[PDB]
Amino acid sequence: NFMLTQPHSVSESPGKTVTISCTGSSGSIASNYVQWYQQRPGSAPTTVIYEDNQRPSGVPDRFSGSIDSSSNSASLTISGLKTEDEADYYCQSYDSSNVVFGGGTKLTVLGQPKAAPSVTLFPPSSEELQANKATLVCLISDFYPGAVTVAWKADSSPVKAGVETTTPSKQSNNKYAASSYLSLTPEQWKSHRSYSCQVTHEGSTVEKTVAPT
Amino acid sequence: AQKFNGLTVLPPLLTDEMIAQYTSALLAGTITSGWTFGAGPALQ
Amino acid sequence: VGYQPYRVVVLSFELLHAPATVCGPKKSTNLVKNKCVNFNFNGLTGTGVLTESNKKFLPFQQFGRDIADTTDAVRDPQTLEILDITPCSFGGVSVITPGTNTSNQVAVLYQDVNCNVFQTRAGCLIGAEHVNNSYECDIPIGAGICASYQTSQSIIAYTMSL
Amino acid sequence: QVQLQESGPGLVKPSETLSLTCTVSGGSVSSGGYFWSWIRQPPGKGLEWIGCIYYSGSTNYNPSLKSRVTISVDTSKDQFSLKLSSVTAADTAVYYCARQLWLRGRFDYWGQGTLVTVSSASTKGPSVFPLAPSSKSTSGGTAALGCLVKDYFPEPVTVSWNSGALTSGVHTFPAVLQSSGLYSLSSVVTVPSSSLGTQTYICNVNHKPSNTKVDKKVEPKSCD
Amino acid sequence: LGKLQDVVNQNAQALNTLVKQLSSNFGAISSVLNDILSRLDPPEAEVQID
Amino acid sequence: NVTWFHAIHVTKRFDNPVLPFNDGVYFASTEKSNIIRGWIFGTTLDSKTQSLLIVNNATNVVIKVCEFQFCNDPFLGVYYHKNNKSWMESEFRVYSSANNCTFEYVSQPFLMDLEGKQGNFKNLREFVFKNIDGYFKIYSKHTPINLVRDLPQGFSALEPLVDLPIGINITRFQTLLALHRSYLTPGDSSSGWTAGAAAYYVGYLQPRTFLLKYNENGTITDAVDCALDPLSETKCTLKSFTVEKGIYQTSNFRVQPTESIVRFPNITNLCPFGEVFNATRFASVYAWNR
Amino acid sequence: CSNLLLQYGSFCTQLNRALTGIAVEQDKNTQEVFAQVKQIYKTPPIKDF
Ligand SMILES: *[C@@H]1O[C@H](CO)[C@@H](O)[C@H](O)[C@H]1NC(C)=O
Ligand SMILES: *[C@@H]1O[C@H](CO)[C@@H](O)[C@H](O)[C@H]1NC(C)=O
Ligand SMILES: *[C@@H]1O[C@H](CO)[C@@H](O)[C@H](O)[C@H]1NC(C)=O
Ligand SMILES: *[C@@H]1O[C@H](CO)[C@@H](O)[C@H](O)[C@H]1NC(C)=O
Ligand SMILES: *[C@@H]1O[C@H](CO)[C@@H](O)[C@H](O)[C@H]1NC(C)=O
Ligand SMILES: *[C@@H]1O[C@H](CO)[C@@H](O)[C@H](O)[C@H]1NC(C)=O
Ligand SMILES: *[C@@H]1O[C@H](CO)[C@@H](O)[C@H](O)[C@H]1NC(C)=O
Ligand SMILES: *[C@@H]1O[C@H](CO)[C@@H](O)[C@H](O)[C@H]1NC(C)=O
Ligand SMILES: *[C@@H]1O[C@H](CO)[C@@H](O)[C@H](O)[C@H]1NC(C)=O
């Protein structure tokens, strides 16, 4: 029942010396060796320290680790933060023939400002209607921050069934992109006079409408 | 063997089977034609 | 889990102006067979494959010789296993050329090396396809098989027609 | 040096048997007296230790994953494989084959992580529908057009515009889970409205696991 | 003609090989014998010339 | 597979990385309007070693190896005068300063065109730089051609021009490029410039035996290799260019071992010590077993 | 050992050409004795001679 407690989110501007902790619950932190792993997103983890004070050949000297055995906490000291340091940090233990890893610490730093949320609406195609299907697609792009709330409307009634939306994702021009999809039957598409998608972004609302034509 | 010190033995171009085939063709020629096959077309 | 009697031992090391011999740096490595691997079994640094032999040694010997006086059998000290020694590099290379103003592609022949690719009786032949029919051959190779350039058109190897 | 490479299918159905093999090149499995270990990491969560093996029959397993892991070592093929039983929907994790220098030490060399996803459906091709621009589809001097990819299994699908000739303004969107198993996304491009009726825009949706390539032309909407 | 060509080509290549033999050191420090005599005294260069 | 670098404007392509100087390099350029000027050599470029500077100015070629204070990206600047309809060089920014050196060479004057265009290339220039025992080697020959890309398969040897007895280290090299400052550009070297159209190829020389073809005039015609193709190996082993039908032995196949395992003992026969850890009973901390 | 063989590389060139010369001279020996005829005459099935 030995688990390593690790801070979920630690954020710091570059250039200052920051400390990442790793606390053991039952077993003492000096009982077994603790290994820290710095893993890039979409990449294999890489060992950055070993034996709690020894830096492997290749990593910078700034990866300094200290052991506070009285508080049963393993500490990793990072000095001189840089851009490439944004990665997940996990601490390892061994307990008794059972390797236990840490919770995880992303090294967040302390970037484009508020952008205008362009919205586009697309009616269902005739080919989809011939396949006994219908889909309303809402497009959200070129916006900031990445928190957009979508709400489909059937003329005046809000629509929730069949609504599928996407989390905002980074664009190439530093901005954000998202979408919402409304699965619908061909009969329900022509039952209402018009459909509309409303995008709420930082209080401002951008609304487009579609009609069966 | 004698090949462990780089003293490789190159195999012959003609194996023992076609050498036997060479002899048997000569044997059949000298019993069915005599010397006509050795100085021109074979005559029975 | 915090008051049971634990057995704690300390293994400290001594460093002075004395020879270091209690330590053994030599490590018995893995045994690999049927691969061209270099070994040093107490009398020689020989390179070759280690096949499974079918002849046992008398229980006082370590090496093994042949009619040609070559070390080709050594008993493994790890498990008293008799292993044979055979060199890997055999012969040289040969190239089949159709000739000037006839073709440009060539075929590479290995002399005594075991392996588009045809395993002939005279080694390995690569770059020349094998065809079952037999014509009169012009470029001799050995072991009753020749090579030639026929029908586009590519280099082929076949049994010679007598 | 020495490297570790994984293999095996990236998909497995629920309540089935998993078979992923990690191959070794540039080294020997039974040489050096080292260990092999399998470590998984779900997307957005921390690393989880599955088990460790020796080149002999010694195995030790996570008590949360006990009686479900089966890992074996074949020295002749210079590789070792892990078998998992009773895989559920929570087993979506990126599996890492990492060599372990010291048992209680660190995994000095980590293999590239294969993506393993589980879903309860049959492998089906995508349904590509045109997304017709119109007057309501433009805001100013520029318009937008795209293609809709709906009801496919599994990930991933790649959408290219004009066989990759159009890249500026192309936005390829991460998929989301539909209400019934399958996935859905869309890829759109921003274009000036002047070339709506004079330029042909064709999207190329490819689904490699289902071996389906669909080319769909995009035209302005015609009122009927 | 093959029988008339090999007897000339082999002799030519043997003469060429003899000419090439004087370009080798045979384990010495130079090929031409005047050079060691020019840079080294004859009492010390006796082993090289031999 | 040899590297390729661009110098055209139409965008804004200007790349000058510090390539390492191996044992001999090959430098080929399809120069048209003489955009390129020269080359700079050295090891660290911090006024600590003897660093070359081989440049070709509008009046004379200048060769001087010294300890110049090289900047990050030296370049030659050409300005377009308003009253004079000719391009002349004004921005001579190749180093900051210099302290001391010995060698300096001038040779005969060389004339080139300072005007850059965007048309197709008309000439091909190849250069080879070699340092053996510290001796610096130059090999070059101008060859006309009508082509932009995919260099022809024709043959042309390279003759030496100057042999410089310097006798120093060399481990890195860098080429120099010239940009124009016309009325279209604002004239600042930050984001607005133009470089015409040029392309230079950089290759690394490797030690291989080459079979050379000497004609009755005394010039090179062919350079058939020995470690490229089996056919070329047969050509250069027989010392002939025409190969007849038959078997020719060229070399030998060697199976080099990949692993080296040595095992003198069977076990270290460790003296029993588990006993102290597994003894029927242990000792206390006031009197512990040693 | 191979660096010092370049001083005697001509000796090995004579030797390899000699051994190749013997090997090709040996292959031709079988052709001059057994290959007197260019047609294989089959033995007739009738053995009454
Ligand atoms: C050549 O090697 C292959 C595989 O190593 C083997 O199957 C074959 O028998 C070998 N050939 C001979 C002639 O031994
Ligand atoms: C040649 O013909 C024989 C006749 O049975 C056949 O067995 C053999 O496979 C053939 N060879 C090729 C290369 O087709
Ligand atoms: C291009 O160059 C690289 C590295 O020099 C080489 O690995 C590659 O094989 C080359 N391409 C071709 C087609 O040979
Ligand atoms: C060209 O540059 C050299 C130095 O490389 C200099 O000595 C010479 O005076 C320059 N020519 C002119 C016309 O300024
Ligand atoms: C040039 O001056 C430097 C001092 O920085 C000295 O080390 C070097 O030897 C001098 N060069 C010559 C050729 O005297
Ligand atoms: C020349 O450079 C090499 C390494 O590039 C170095 O080992 C050597 O000492 C240098 N010699 C001089 C005289 O600078
Ligand atoms: C080389 O000289 C010979 C003899 O004068 C002449 O026939 C031949 O044309 C010359 N070659 C060239 C390329 O000028
Ligand atoms: C070396 O020791 C091992 C294990 O103790 C044993 O299996 C082997 O037979 C021994 N070899 C000898 C005594 O030659
Ligand atoms: C002590 O004895 C037990 C049982 O005989 C054995 O399993 C163990 O390996 C021995 N050594 C230690 C250090 O416990």
DSSP letters for chain F:
--EEEE------------EE--SSEEEEE--SS-----EEEESS-SSSS-B-EEEE-SS-EEEE-B-----SS-EEEEEE-SSS-SEEEEEEES-S-------EE--S----------S---EEEEEEEEEETTEEEEEEEEEE---SSS--S-----EEEEEE-------EEEE--EEEE-SSS-S-TTT--B--S-EEEEEE-----EEEEE-SSS-EEEEEESSS-HHHHHHHHTT-S---SEEEEEEE------EEE----S---PPP-HHHHH-SS---SSS---
Tell me which residue in C7, C40, C113 faces F282 most closely, judged by beta carbons: C7
**DSSP characters over A49-104:** -BTTTBPPBTB-TTEEEEEETTTTEEEEEE-S--GGG-SEEEEEE-TTT--EE---
Contact F239, F228 (CB under 8 A): no
Instruction: Kindly determine whether residue C162 and residue G40, on different chains, have CB atoms separated by under 8 Å.
Output: yes
Long-range contact pairs involving A7-13 (C-beta distance under 8 Å, separation at least 24)? A7/A103, A7/A105, A8/A103, A8/A104, A8/A105, A9/A105, A9/A106, A9/A108, A10/A105, A10/A106, A10/A107, A10/A108, A11/A107, A11/A108, A11/A109, A11/A110, A12/A81, A12/A107, A12/A108, A12/A109, A12/A110, A13/A81, A13/A109, A13/A110
CA of C115 to the centre of ligand 1 (A): 7
Peptide bond into A145 cis (omega under 30): yes
Instruction: Kindly determine whether residue B29 and residue G42, on different chains, have CB atoms separated by under 8 Å.
Output: no
H or E element at residue A146: none
β-strand pairing of A169-170 with C45-48: unpaired
Contacts of A53 (CB under 8 A, 6+ apart): A64, A65, A66, A67
Chains G and B touch each other (3 or more Cβ pairs < 8 A) = yes
- Max distance between CA atoms of chain A, in angstroms, equals 74
Instruction: Kindly determine whether residue E24 and residue G10, on different chains, have CB atoms separated by under 8 Å.
Output: yes
**Partners of residue G31 in chain B, C-beta under 8 Å:** 14
Contact F170, F41 (CB under 8 A): yes
- For residue C112, the chain B residue with the least C-alpha distance is B8
Preceding residues of all breaks in chain E (C to N beyond 2.5 angstroms)? Answer: none
Q: Which atom of ligand 2 is nearest to the CA of C131?
A: 13
Instruction: Kindly determine whether residue G13 and residue E27, on different chains, have CB atoms separated by under 8 Å.
Output: no
Instruction: Kindly determine whether residue G27 and residue B13, on different chains, have CB atoms separated by under 8 Å.
Output: yes
CA of F218 to the centre of ligand 7 (A): 9
Cα(C12)–Cα(A55) distance, integer angstroms: 24
CA of F47 to the centre of ligand 6 (A): 16
CA of A35 to the centre of ligand 9 (A): 28
CA of F175 to the centre of ligand 4 (A): 18
Closest-CA distance, D184 to chain A, in angstroms, reads 8
Cα(D99)–Cα(F165) distance, integer angstroms: 54
Around F105, how many Cα atoms within 13 Å sit in the side-chain half-sphere? 16
Interhelix angle for E3-21 vs G9-33, to 10°?
160
Cα(C98)–Cα(C104) distance, integer angstroms: 8
Partner chains of G (3+ C-beta pairs under 8 Å): B, C, E
Resolution in A: 4.1
* Strands annotated E in A149-194: 149-154, 157-159, 163-165, 169-170, 176-184
**How many residue pairs from chains A and D have C-beta atoms closer than 8 A?**
134
**Partners of residue C108 in chain F, C-beta under 8 Å:** 230
Contact of D30 with chain C, judged by CB distance below 8 Å, is answered with yes
Instruction: Kindly determine whether residue A45 and residue D47, on different chains, have CB atoms separated by under 8 Å.
Output: yes
Ligand 4 in reach of F59 Cβ (< 6 A): yes
Tell me which residue in C24, C32, C102 faces F261 most closely, judged by beta carbons: C32
Chains A and E touch each other (3 or more Cβ pairs < 8 A) = no
Q: Which atom of ligand 4 is nearest to the CA of F92?
A: 2
Q: Which ligand is nearest to the CA of F88?
A: 4
Burial of D163 (0-12, 13-18, 19+ CB in 10 A): exposed
Phi, psi dihedral angles at F219 (to 5 degrees):
-125, 160
Ligand 4 in reach of F98 Cβ (< 6 A): no
- For residue A4, the chain D residue with the least C-alpha distance is D46
Instruction: Kindly determine whether residue D134 and residue A100, on different chains, have CB atoms separated by under 8 Å.
Output: no
Ligand 9 in reach of F273 Cβ (< 6 A): no
Contact C72, C86 (CB under 8 A): yes
Cα(F230)–Cα(F237) distance, integer angstroms: 10
In SS3 terms, D98-111 reads as EEECCCCCCCCEEC
Contact of D27 with chain A, judged by CB distance below 8 Å, is answered with no
Ligand 9 in reach of F277 Cβ (< 6 A): yes
Ligand 2, pocket-test mutation among C117, C118, C119, C132, most atoms within 8 A of CB: C132
- The count of residues in chain E is 50
Contact of D137 with chain A, judged by CB distance below 8 Å, is answered with yes
Nearest alpha-carbon partner for D197 in D221, D215, D214, D224: D221
**Token reading at C80:** 């008293």
- For residue G33, the chain B residue with the least C-alpha distance is B22
- For residue D27, the chain C residue with the least C-alpha distance is C30
Closest-CA distance, C33 to chain D, in angstroms, reads 11
Ligand 9 in reach of F278 Cβ (< 6 A): yes
In SS3 terms, C5-74 reads as CCCCCCCCCCCCCCCCCCCCCCCCCCCCCCCCEEEECCCCEEEEECCECCCCCCCCCCCCCCCCCCCCEE
Contacts of A50 (CB under 8 A, 6+ apart): A33, A35, A56, D105, D106
CA of C9 to the centre of ligand 8 (A): 29
Looking at residue A48, its amino acid is: V
Burial of F214 (0-12, 13-18, 19+ CB in 10 A): exposed
Q: What does DSSP assign to residue G5? A: G
Q: What does DSSP assign to residue G14? A: H
**Partners of residue F260 in chain C, C-beta under 8 Å:** 37-40
CA of C157 to the centre of ligand 2 (A): 14
Q: Three-state SS for D129?
A: strand
Distances (CA, A) of F215 to C98, D33, E16, F157, F223: 26, 64, 20, 12, 12
Ligand 6 in reach of F185 Cβ (< 6 A): no
Phi, psi dihedral angles at A63 (to 5 degrees):
-75, 80
Contact of C136 with chain B, judged by CB distance below 8 Å, is answered with no
Q: What does DSSP assign to residue D141? A: S
Ligand 9, pocket-test mutation among F278, F281, F282, most atoms within 8 A of CB: F278
G interface with B, Cβ–Cβ < 8 A, is 23, 26-27, 30-31, 34-37, 39-44, 49
Contact of D181 with chain C, judged by CB distance below 8 Å, is answered with no
Instruction: Kindly determine whether residue D47 and residue A131, on different chains, have CB atoms separated by under 8 Å.
Output: no
Partner chains of D (3+ C-beta pairs under 8 Å): A, C
- Residues of C (22-61) whose Cβ lies below 8 Å from B: none
Q: Which atom of ligand 4 is nearest to the CA of F57?
A: 1
Burial of F114 (0-12, 13-18, 19+ CB in 10 A): middle
How was this structure obtained? cryo-EM
Q: What is the CA radius of gyration of chain D?
A: 23
Contact D216, D131 (CB under 8 A): no
Contacts of A178 (CB under 8 A, 6+ apart): A140, A141, A143, A146, A148, A165, A166, A167, A168, A169, D173
Cα(A20)–Cα(A5) distance, integer angstroms: 11
Phi, psi dihedral angles at D194 (to 5 degrees):
-70, -35
